[PDB]
Amino acid sequence: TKGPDAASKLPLVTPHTQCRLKLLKLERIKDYLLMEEEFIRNQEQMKEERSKVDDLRGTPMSVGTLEEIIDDNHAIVSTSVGSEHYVSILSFVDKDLLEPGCSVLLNHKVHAVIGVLMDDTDPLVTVMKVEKAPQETYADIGGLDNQIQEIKESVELPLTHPEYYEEMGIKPPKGVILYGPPGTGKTLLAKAVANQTSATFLRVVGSELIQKYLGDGPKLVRELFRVAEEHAPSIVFIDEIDAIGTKRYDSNSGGEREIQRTMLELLNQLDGFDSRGDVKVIMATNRIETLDPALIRPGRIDRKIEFPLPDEKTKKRIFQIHTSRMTLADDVTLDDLIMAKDDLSGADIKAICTEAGLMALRERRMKVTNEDFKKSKENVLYKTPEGLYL
Amino acid sequence: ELSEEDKQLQDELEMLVERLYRPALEELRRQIRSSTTSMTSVPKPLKFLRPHYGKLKEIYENMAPGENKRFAADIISVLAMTMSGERECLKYRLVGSQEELASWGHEYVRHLAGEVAKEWQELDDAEKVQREPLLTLVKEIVPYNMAHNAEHEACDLLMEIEQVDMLEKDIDENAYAKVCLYLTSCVNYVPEPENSALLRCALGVFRKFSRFPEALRLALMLNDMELVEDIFTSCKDVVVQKQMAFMLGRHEEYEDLTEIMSNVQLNSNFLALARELDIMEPKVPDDIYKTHLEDSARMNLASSFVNGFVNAAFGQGNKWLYKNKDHGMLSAAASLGMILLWDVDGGLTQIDKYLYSSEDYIKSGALLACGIVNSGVRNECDPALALLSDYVLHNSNTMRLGSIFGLGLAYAGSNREDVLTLLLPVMGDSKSSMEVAGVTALACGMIAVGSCNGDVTSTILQTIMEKSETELKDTYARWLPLGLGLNHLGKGEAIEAILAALEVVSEPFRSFANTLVDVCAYAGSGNVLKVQQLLHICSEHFDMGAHQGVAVLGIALIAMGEEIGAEMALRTFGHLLRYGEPTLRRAVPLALALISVSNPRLNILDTLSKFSHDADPEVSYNSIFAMGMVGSGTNNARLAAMLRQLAQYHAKDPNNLFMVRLAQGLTHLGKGTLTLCPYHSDRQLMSQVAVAGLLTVLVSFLDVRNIILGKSHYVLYGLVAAMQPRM
Amino acid sequence: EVPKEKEKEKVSTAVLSITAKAKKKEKEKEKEPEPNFQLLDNPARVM
Ligand SMILES: Nc1ncnc2c1ncn2[C@@H]1O[C@H](COP(=O)(O)OP(=O)(O)OP(=O)(O)O)[C@@H](O)[C@H]1O
Numbered sequence A: 001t002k003g004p005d006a007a008s009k010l011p012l013v014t015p016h017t018q019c020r021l022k023l024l025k026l027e028r029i030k031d032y033l034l035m036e037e038e039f040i041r042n043q044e045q046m047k048e049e050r051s052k053v054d055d056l057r058g059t060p061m062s063v064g065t066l067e068e069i070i071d072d073n074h075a076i077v078s079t080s081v082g083s084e085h086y087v088s089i090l091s092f093v094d095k096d097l098l099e100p101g102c103s104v105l106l107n108h109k110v111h112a113v114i115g116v117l118m119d120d121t122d123p124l125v126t127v128m129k130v131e132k133a134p135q136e137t138y139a140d141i142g143g144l145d146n147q148i149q150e151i152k153e154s155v156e157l158p159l160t161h162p163e164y165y166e167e168m169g170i171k172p173p174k175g176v177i178l179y180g181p182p183g184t185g186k187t188l189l190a191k192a193v194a195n196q197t198s199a200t201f202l203r204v205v206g207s208e209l210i211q212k213y214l215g216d217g218p219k220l221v222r223e224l225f226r227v228a229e230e231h232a233p234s235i236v237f238i239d240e241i242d243a244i245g246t247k248r249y250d251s252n253s254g255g256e257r258e259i260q261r262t263m264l265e266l267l268n269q270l271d272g273f274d275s276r277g278d279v280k281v282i283m284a285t286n287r288i289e290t291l292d293p294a295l296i297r298p299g300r301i302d303r304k305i306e307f308p309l310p311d312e313k314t315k316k317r318i319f320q321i322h323t324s325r326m327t328l329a330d331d332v333t334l335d336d337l338i339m340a341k342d343d344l345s346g347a348d349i350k351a352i353c354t355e356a357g358l359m360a361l362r363e364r365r366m367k368v369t370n371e372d373f374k375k376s377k378e379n380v381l382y383k384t385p386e387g388l389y390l
Numbered sequence B: 001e002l003s004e005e006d007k008q009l010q011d012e013l014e015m016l017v018e019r020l021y022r023p024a025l026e027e028l029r030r031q032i033r034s035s036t037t038s039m040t041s042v043p044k045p046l047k048f049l050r051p052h053y054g055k056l057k058e059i060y061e062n063m064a065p066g067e068n069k070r071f072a073a074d075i076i077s078v079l080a081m082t083m084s085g086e087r088e089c090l091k092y093r094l095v096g097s098q099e100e101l102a103s104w105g106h107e108y109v110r111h112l113a114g115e116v117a118k119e120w121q122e123l124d125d126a127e128k129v130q131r132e133p134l135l136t137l138v139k140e141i142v143p144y145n146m147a148h149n150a151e152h153e154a155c156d157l158l159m160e161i162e163q164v165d166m167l168e169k170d171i172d173e174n175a176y177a178k179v180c181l182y183l184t185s186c187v188n189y190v191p192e193p194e195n196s197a198l199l200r201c202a203l204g205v206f207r208k209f210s211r212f213p214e215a216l217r218l219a220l221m222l223n224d225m226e227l228v229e230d231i232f233t234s235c236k237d238v239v240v241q242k243q244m245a246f247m248l249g250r251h252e253e254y255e256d257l258t259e260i261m262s263n264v265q266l267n268s269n270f271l272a273l274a275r276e277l278d279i280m281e282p283k284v285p286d287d288i289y290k291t292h293l294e295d296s297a298r299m300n301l302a303s304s305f306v307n308g309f310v311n312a313a314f315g316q317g318n319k320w321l322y323k324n325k326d327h328g329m330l331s332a333a334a335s336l337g338m339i340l341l342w343d344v345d346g347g348l349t350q351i352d353k354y355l356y357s358s359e360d361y362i363k364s365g366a367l368l369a370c371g372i373v374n375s376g377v378r379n380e381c382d383p384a385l386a387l388l389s390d391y392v393l394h395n396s397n398t399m400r401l402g403s404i405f406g407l408g409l410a411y412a413g414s415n416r417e418d419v420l421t422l423l424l425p426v427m428g429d430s431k432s433s434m435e436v437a438g439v440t441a442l443a444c445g446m447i448a449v450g451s452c453n454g455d456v457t458s459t460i461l462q463t464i465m466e467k468s469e470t471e472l473k474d475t476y477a478r479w480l481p482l483g484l485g486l487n488h489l490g491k492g493e494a495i496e497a498i499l500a501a502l503e504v505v506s507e508p509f510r511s512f513a514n515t516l517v518d519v520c521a522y523a524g525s526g527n528v529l530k531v532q533q534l535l536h537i538c539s540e541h542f543d544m545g546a547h548q549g550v551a552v553l554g555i556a557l558i559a560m561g562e563e564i565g566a567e568m569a570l571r572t573f574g575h576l577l578r579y580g581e582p583t584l585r586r587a588v589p590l591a592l593a594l595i596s597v598s599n600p601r602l603n604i605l606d607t608l609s610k611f612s613h614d615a616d617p618e619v620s621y622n623s624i625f626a627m628g629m630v631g632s633g634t635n636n637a638r639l640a641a642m643l644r645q646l647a648q649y650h651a652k653d654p655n656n657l658f659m660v661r662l663a664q665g666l667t668h669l670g671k672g673t674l675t676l677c678p679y680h681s682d683r684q685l686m687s688q689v690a691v692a693g694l695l696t697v698l699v700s701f702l703d704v705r706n707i708i709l710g711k712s713h714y715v716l717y718g719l720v721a722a723m724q725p726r727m
Numbered sequence C: 001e002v003p004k005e006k007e008k009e010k011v012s013t014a015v016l017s018i019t020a021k022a023k024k025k026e027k028e029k030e031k032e033p034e035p036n037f038q039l040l041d042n043p044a045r046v047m
């Protein structure tokens, strides 16, 4: 329960089109940043008893795991060898931080209690922690307005307006799936939440909760959710949950049962016996028909958001987004692609724009043309018999 | 690659450069058809005549007038703008009689504009003769820009190194959205008085297009009351004149122009919008609190403050006022007058009834009630002026201490000579007491509102010239600098003389004087050199404290425009309190509050909370009041919840509980109907109204232990003077 | 001679990109032979 961590993001100069206004704004960023760096360097360069006490402290402090504190100055600790000891307790510890399972610090020679290390989170989870601020705010999310509204109600509003719900006793949703075809914005709508959310964001990948050591997966999951609850009123983004989410079956192998165990621990965390704090789960998947009702349940996953292949208006707005930063030719009408009802994803629109720019560059030009868009679509698109209907 | 036809063209170029001169000029210049090509980059002749660049340049050097030497300069200069060949050859080409650019491309136009710019920077005030041809150039280019919608680039040329009027005057019509908003942003971020240059440039654009309810607000950014009347003069349409009068008040047919300017009916508008979504409800403190969800005079003060901050100006007292114990001062009488804000009608009656009453704590409160009620509304029949001018003239505290702030409340932001003559002679206060002198300076400055009034500046200067060595460095003598700062706002570099005059003051003091004068000066505009000065003056370690405090408040005040700057300043202040001395830590919350008053963003809320439960009670008080100021006039959620958690944590801490309950009262302040935010218009006005109140509040809270937990409390009602409606 | 302990000086103001501009604006607005003898005393430190 340390409190929210979130991420540090510098301000975003509003202009994108190459402009002296953009230059001026970005030089404003530069000058304040240089000023911060100055203050740091200046003050920290321009500008006893505890020193000797910490010297007495064993220099190569080891880490054990406390077990069954006894008395006031004699606590039992362990070691990373399977052995354990009835070690002494010095006068340097704050005390009251020593609880069973606590990763304690110990002296190399004396093997006493010389610390508590109330900071031990597994590397496999701290690396997954998010501290960058990916610049994907809710401006490049063409259309998808209903999905963004739902996700905003789920994630933002019980942080920036915790009065609507308390006014009427209702409690905010705890989980949201984003499910759909290959390329719709299910990950952009997570990136933008990371951007505008002042709460900690936690990457997660389903293929990351499957661990080699038997029983380690349903401990990594506990570590993940304990870090989420302890460290922040946060958000946990399990991308590609179909990596562990498949329906539980009887199975006849060890690995499948272990994966199912990881699922069960995830479910116990989402809605177990005890409770859940202010951790909001955002899950992503390409197929929702291949998941366990256990995790698709509306107690752990209170909202489900389809991401259907964007319609005509959304597709228009997506070309708008992904060509805005390009030198367009006046002879280009961004409707030839719109009108055709060929399955076009948001990623497909992005690839069309990129490929079109490339064809122009090959034509020795730096501004798109209608023929270039036509060739780009034709050479980008990847993939009922006639007359069976009508 | 070099396709066969491409190599044939290359060989044609080789023969052309190896070989009398008329055909050479003709075909070499026509080969710029590649650049004129509407659909192409990489102009082949450019970069095909790369090895010949030196040969062509030396030929031009060893060239003389005649049939040649005229059109070869075009090719020389295009190969130049590709590589080398600066404006000397550019303008030699142009004198070669080709300025049209029609036979050249948008690329060459932009390159020419940049080249002209960079020669202009390279040059100084000397050799200005070359400028005039270059001015004719810029004049010839800009129409091309307004043709091909390169409005950003045209405005770039205009803003370049200086200010320009010809273009935005001749910028056509009905396509001014860019020259309006984009130049408004450039203005918002300019570092110099060529800010004001771009200000009246945009104003002139509006005037030329006869639609200036944006030069309306630009008038205030232009610190020129003369320009204010100049804009007011035309006002050809009474319909828009009405809106202009309303805007002026918030910041032919003479019957109602002055009435709207003075806002004799703003109370009516506010009450009508209150009826809209009525919240009219005389209340009880606990409901603003939630004590059920968990009689000291300190609790009396806290309850009165919360009740007033919430029900301000709703027209709803001695019975509950009577509970006084020493510090049980005129706080609650001022609270009642404030709950009666802008209600002169019943204000006269109630304040008279409660002025014909008991000792100072009931008459000084009545005078402050009159003033605070009159704040924001003016009339020809001056209200409370007679009482202020006649009563309470004797040398003493309490009485004048409240009366002068009441007069400031009545007529702040007016610069009226009558009240100036009332208050300046009365400023003489060596006869009277020290806090009285401070509040007199407070009112004088709050009326000056940056008027640069020589008389009031002289009064403050002579008052500070009157020096008692021990009195200066004890407490309660900093409002002389405060009044000086209020008298001088954002006038630019026109403060050096005042600084030199003040440089005579004693060394340990006058750090506050200089810093507060400087910050009340240029601010909101944003000057990187100035904020550098502020940060450095913070950064000198002293093994003074209030000097860094004023520096911090100044960083806040200066970084109140650009939101980009505000966020970077949030970062800087986090660093400051992290690697900072206790004085610096105490000052940081004030700066956060000024950055985001009544705009409770989670980042500031989180940072202040994390710094709240501090070992220094002063730090804790600053942080919790910062919470109150960020949440002021918003009813924001979870601020009250976390704040109640903070209170329960500090259950038995008297001062902490009082101040945190005050923060809750700020949180529920005005029930959302009033906000302390400066920048009333387009979030782009360093509003002379309520900036004085906010700055006074922050200066006072720079030291909370001595003044706030002392013998004065009028800071809160100064913050109320800053209050303004949100409807 | 005693080494005069110098004050702990800082780094320069760094280029805020209008520092030089401001300085230029302010500036514009403002606009024994050694002898060949010793004559040593009677006890002479003659090297
Ligand atoms: N509405 C949108 N606007 C712009 N780009 C979009 C939009 N929706 C999707 N994209 C594109 O999506 C790409 C990222 O992949 P996306 O989030 O769509 O994948 P997904 O299939 O939903 O999820 P996952 O990454 O878990 O496979 C980005 O390149 C972005 O261009």
Ligand SMILES: [Mg+2]
Residues within 6 Å of the ligand: A184, A185, A186, A187, A188
């Ligand atoms: Mg995705």
